[PDB]
Structures are given as C-alpha cells and as structure tokens.
C-alpha cells in the first residue's frame, strides 16, 4: 500500500485505474497511527472494525483532485468532476485517504499531467473509467472543427502552480473499495505463552481453558492439534 502511496506520479482523474489487492496481509492500522494524511473518511467502515473484520477484493483508485473539489468525490455526493470523471456508489463500504501533493505534484511552469472531463454526454455509472475521446457531436453539430455549440473538447489540463491557493493546490486521494465475495481468500490483519498455569488460550481457531505443558507426542508435519477418544482436544502445536 505504501508503494502505491509513494508513487512518483499519480493517475489523472480521467485515467483513474483500479489496483487489485489480494494474497497479502494488509495492516490498515498503520495508516491511522501514521497520521500523515490531511484528510481520512471511512464510509460504512470503523478503523478498529476494519482491522478485526476484512472484505476480499480490496481495490485502490489513484487520482489527483483539487482540495476544493475533493468534497465532490464522495459517495452520495454529485459534482461536475464526480459526474463526468469518477463516480462512487452511495452504499460505499470503503475508506478514502487524501493528503496534500503540493511538494511534488505542483510545478511553477504548470503540469499537463493531470486532465479532467468537463463535458460528457451522460453521468458515469459508479466505478466506470471514462473513455470518450470524441468531442461533443450528437449529430446536431458534427465535424472535426469546434462549432462552439457546447462542443469544445472534454479533456482540459489542470493548473497546479505553487502560487495557486491551497484549495487549487493538488491533493493525492486514494479510494479503497471493500466487498464480500464468494471467493474464500480474504485480506485480514499475538501475545506470549504461559505454561503450567490455568490460562485462556486462543490458538489458531482453537479456544479453551487449561494448563499447557511441553509434550512428548510428535505430530506429523501437517497436523495442527491432537485429540483422543471422545474427541476432546488434549494437544496443540
């Protein structure tokens, strides 16, 4: 996750991409205790809950949005940029992280790196990457040339100068999407051992109360815990 956050360049809002996170443990808590992000909003998710309970198919979306229009990119919120660039489902179970990128994403000369779709025929469906290179035509005003009848060109370069105000200054915002799916794999995120004492123990899925002593029984390398007649656990690895 840190590598995605520390990317040298961030994707434009029109060119926003989905990054699949799976087959690795994710430490959600590290993000909060870092507190290096200006803004952090968890919709339908609690930070403690995210650690204990996890959803498979985590998706990371990278795009640069001006701080003033950051509010538009929210679930249940409609904005010029949100309608034609990135759309969030209202019932979103995800956490969005935003931090100022003025130090590296802002250039005195200006950057043609970030572009937005000002004009689109229809509002985008949620999680739909925008792909409409052709200019407004509608067969009312069709030609390579610009009639000026609400035609122009949808993509316009963003301006991110140091002189620009903090709302104008670029902000790096990542959207994390959490969903529950049929596939078994899930991305979820440990005390010490007290022997010869009544303790509660929580071995990997096996819970109970008893005294733990070093044993002489040797398991096969694939066998986790042991049992006996009447099937009461009396050993553990």
């Amino acid at each position, epitope marked *: 996750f840190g590598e*995605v956050f520390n*990317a*040298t*360049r*961030f*994707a*434009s809002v*029109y*060119a*926003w*991409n989905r*990054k699949r996170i799976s087959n690795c443990v994710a430490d959600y808590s590290v993000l909060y205790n870092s507190a290096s992000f200006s803004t952090f909003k968890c919709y339908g998710v609690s930070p403690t809950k995210l650690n204990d309970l996890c959803f498979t198919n985590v998706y990371a979306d*990278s795009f640069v949005i001006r701080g003033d229009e950051v509010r538009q990119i929210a679930p249940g919120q409609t904005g010029k940029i949100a309608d034609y660039n990135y759309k969030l489902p209202d019932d979103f179970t995800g956490c969005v992280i935003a931090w100022n990128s003025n130090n590296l994403d802002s250039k005195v000369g200006g950057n*043609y*790196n*970030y*572009l937005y779709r000002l004009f689109r025929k229809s509002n985008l469906k949620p999680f739909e*990457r925008d*792909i409409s*290179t052709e200019i407004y035509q509608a067969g009312s005003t069709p030609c*390579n*040339g610009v009639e000026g009848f609400n035609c122009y*060109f949808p*993509l316009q*370069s963003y301006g991110f100068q140091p002189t620009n105000g903090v709302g104008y200054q670029p902000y790096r915002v990542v959207v994390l999407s959490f969903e529950l799916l049929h596939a078994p794999a899930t991305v979820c995120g440990s005390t010490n051992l007290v022997k010869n004492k009544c303790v509660n123990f929580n071995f990997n899925g096996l819970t109970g109360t008893g005294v733990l002593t070093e044993s002489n029984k040797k398991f096969l390398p694939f066998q986790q815990f042991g049992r006996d007649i009447a099937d009461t656990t009396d050993a553990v690895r």
Partner: antibody
Amino acid sequence: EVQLVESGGGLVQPGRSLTLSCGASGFTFEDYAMHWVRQAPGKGLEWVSGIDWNSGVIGYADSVKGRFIISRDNAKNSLYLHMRSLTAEDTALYYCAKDVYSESGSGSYYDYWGQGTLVTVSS
Amino acid sequence: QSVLTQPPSVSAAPGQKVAISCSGSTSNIGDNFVSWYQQFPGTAPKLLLYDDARRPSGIPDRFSGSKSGTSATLGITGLQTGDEAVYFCSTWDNSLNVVLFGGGTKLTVL
C-alpha cells in the same frame, strides 16, 4: 519475446486529430512502463510521451505538450496516444517503447521497440 | 533544453576499433547511465548497451565502451561487414524531466 503491434497511423489533414494504438503481448502490460518515441525519416529519434504502472503521465515533449494526450488500460494491455493540432513537424514514425523501470526516473532502458506506424500530416 | 551530441557519421575498416562519443549536460548523463541503441537502416531500434558497459543478452562481447564524467563512449572491436548501423545514446534528464535522445552516429563499412 515481447511484440508491440502498431496501428491507427495514416495520412491526415493538419487541423484534424488522430489516435495511435499499441498492442502489448509476451509480457505483463501493467508491470512494465510504456513510452512513445517518434523518428522522422533522415532525423534522430525523438521521445514523445511516457506513462507508468499507475497510468500517471510522466510527461510530454515540450513541442507536443498540450496537443498530445497519453492513456493506457492495464486490463486491455493496450496504450493509446491522442494527437491534436497535427503539423508537418509532427509527421514522423511512432514506435511503441517498452520500459523496464516503471518510475523511469533513472537507469530506465527500452527492452523492446515496436515496428511503428507512419503518421503523415499534409493538406 | 540540453541536446545529447553525437558525431554525424563514422567509417572504419573491418578489424579497426570504433569510438562513438555522446555529450550531455551534468543533470542528464551524470544522474543516470546512458543507454546505447543500435538501429539498422529501415528497422526498429534494438538496445545495444544497458546501464553503460553492461550488455543485454544477445549483444556481442566485442561491443564495449566506458562513460567518464558527462561523456559516454561506445567502443566496437572486431568490426565486421554488415555491422553498419545508426547508434543513438539515450539518457533521461532529471532537470528537464524528459527523456533525451542523441542525434545519432552513422557507422558504415565501404
């Protein structure tokens, strides 16, 4: 073996637009950064555009800045260059470039080069 | 905008060492190693040298060269007929934030 298919290159009028499509096969498209390099015949190679794993735009040649748009889809394994305000200077042979380094900041070399397509801009 | 400088054309007899010089500003060549590309006329360019002296698989050991300071040198030994090609040195510039490509040198045998 990495194969870089080239298409969407044809004779075009100056005040028109043209899209170039590069097909990536034999390697993971998302893993390796993709770059655009053009070379007019009888002239030295000229870097035009760069993109990375996160699809963030590395930059554009100063001459093509504000007239050229670069975009890629990791799922489709394809990258598209949109050219506007085409000029006689723009006329060249655009070869797809595969870059080993995603950040392309340092020690970044082009492992494979596409055959290329010929954009001609004339009245 | 800094431009990588290369001699226009070089001609040498087979079996004669060939030296090609790439000239760049400190910000471009100094920060990252130059990459040499051997392009046969009418063919797509093929990488000849990666990270200066190191050679990618499929490049002859006779190809060599050392970059000192802001200058990158390509050394060709055991030159043969059909080795004629245009050589381009490419080094991205941190200051310009754009990749820089050399004008190129036209190696040939009579």
